[PDB]
Amino acid sequence: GGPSVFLFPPKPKDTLMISRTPEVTCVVVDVSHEDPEVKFNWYVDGVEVHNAKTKPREEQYNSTYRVVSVLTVLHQDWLNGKEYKCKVSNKALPAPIEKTISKAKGQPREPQVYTLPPSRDELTKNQVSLTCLVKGFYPSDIAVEWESNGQPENNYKTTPPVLDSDGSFFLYSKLTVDKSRWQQGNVFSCSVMHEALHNHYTQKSLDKSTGK
Amino acid sequence: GGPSVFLFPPKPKDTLMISRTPEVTCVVVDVSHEDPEVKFNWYVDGVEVHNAKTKPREEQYNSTYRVVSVLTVLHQDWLNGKEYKCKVSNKALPAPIEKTISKAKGQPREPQVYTLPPSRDELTKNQVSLTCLVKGFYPSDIAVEWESNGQPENNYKTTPPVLDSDGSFFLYSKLTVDKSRWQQGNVFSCSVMHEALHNHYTQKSLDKSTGK
Amino acid sequence: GGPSVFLFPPKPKDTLMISRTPEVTCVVVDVSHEDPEVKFNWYVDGVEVHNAKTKPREEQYNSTYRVVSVLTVLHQDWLNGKEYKCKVSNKALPAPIEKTISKAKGQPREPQVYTLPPSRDELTKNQVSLTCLVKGFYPSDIAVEWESNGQPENNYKTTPPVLDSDGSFFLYSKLTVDKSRWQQGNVFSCSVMHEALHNHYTQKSLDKSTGK
Known about the structure:
3 chains; 212 residues; mainly beta; 5-stranded antiparallel β-sheet; 3 helices; 14 strands; immune system
């Protein structure tokens, strides 16, 4: 009944790491009640692809459906930039809607990662802010995390990728740790994951000796 | 006639990296010439599917044919220790044989990675050697590499994993660089890939000011 | 059925240290239990030596015997590159099996021994690891041992000799000692025994002595 499709690219984390599988999603919006199940066929460069299960007729509080179709997309295909259309092949609908999705085209650029210690004014406050400047990467598909002593840190917020003057992107990651951990020799490292990096991974540490 | 059978596990780098596809190898020597094709049907728990990447046979300089069968092993599937579609069952051989292969079982341990600067006795030499001690990992499947800035450094040799006194393993990676690069302040990082590490990856840097 | 013969080379310490005895040992396995006839013709440079030590054979689970023959030779004979053929004559195998045992020929390279202190990240743990890098020796037959005050520090593991890029071999020795012993001011030395060294022996000390 004249639906709307929302595209969803895979997470760069899931794309660039092996422990989490990547998925590509085409969320349908406001489909008719006479067709509660929407048949979804994944057209990988026009080639029909099997499996790729879908969420079975999930319904909002309003009289509408939020049918979600996912596909276990391999990492190498998304790295090489395979276009996925998600053609709607429902039984009784109007003309099909094609919405291709793929990796961001263009020459990949290796990000330059810089760890910035907190300002001296931040040492007045209880919690200091640790800054990871990731700049120079052209594809915005990046994953920036933090870790200390080999274990992940979850008290971080990362800005969205901001387009630079060079045509590349930059962002910042702010890890908020309390002053007690920072004033002792605790090593905090931001680990970014980008397709243009060597081994799709790099790490920059920050352990209060940066700038000494 | 049943030939001799040899099994090769997938490389630890390819298992924990996006850009490399893991593959099991079942190179079999002295295969009979009169029956070239070998059956390659072996599920994890029997025979259920037909997914196998058939490869052409390799011929030795005399009359000892060899068959090579490799298949693309999923990264998540190998980390749990499953069997794959690689068996040896010749048409001439009446009794097929099943050579099992799986990832080593046991509790994984996270390796502790230490970068050691060259000894002061090595500063007289033209080339200094940087050592990456990786110790405390129970699965010996690990890939240790070196890099400077962002580009990899290929002038490294890595020892095989050595069983420690506590049941875990350790090894070393010796990166041989020129003494001029060491005194110039270049930063070299050894990057190891183990399944028990966070993000299956860690990176320890090394420069002339490490530890004074 | 068919007898399989494995030659055992002398231990690298026992052939380079006087307190021990070289063990040119021949172990023939999978010989028939119904054949109590063996020969001990040790063709040392084409000359049979009567100093071979015959022992009662070892019985396996199946009907087979494991005859072990140990021949003791002087240290200077093995280091001069002599052949130690052992003629194994028995009624099970009509062809006598000769095992060519000799020192690995080639120009000997003197190993360069470097002691590396524990990394500053290692000092957090209660047990630090002390490293002896032995590199640049061509004959892989080497012996590395640790000591502190003239007494053997037996809590060490040594990697196998890894072939270097220039044709020589290298390895590492890791001595695990308590953090209290390291920071007290104790001196530890790795003792390396190689045939290309002066007096077939060298050692490098390692103590808590920060440079400059």
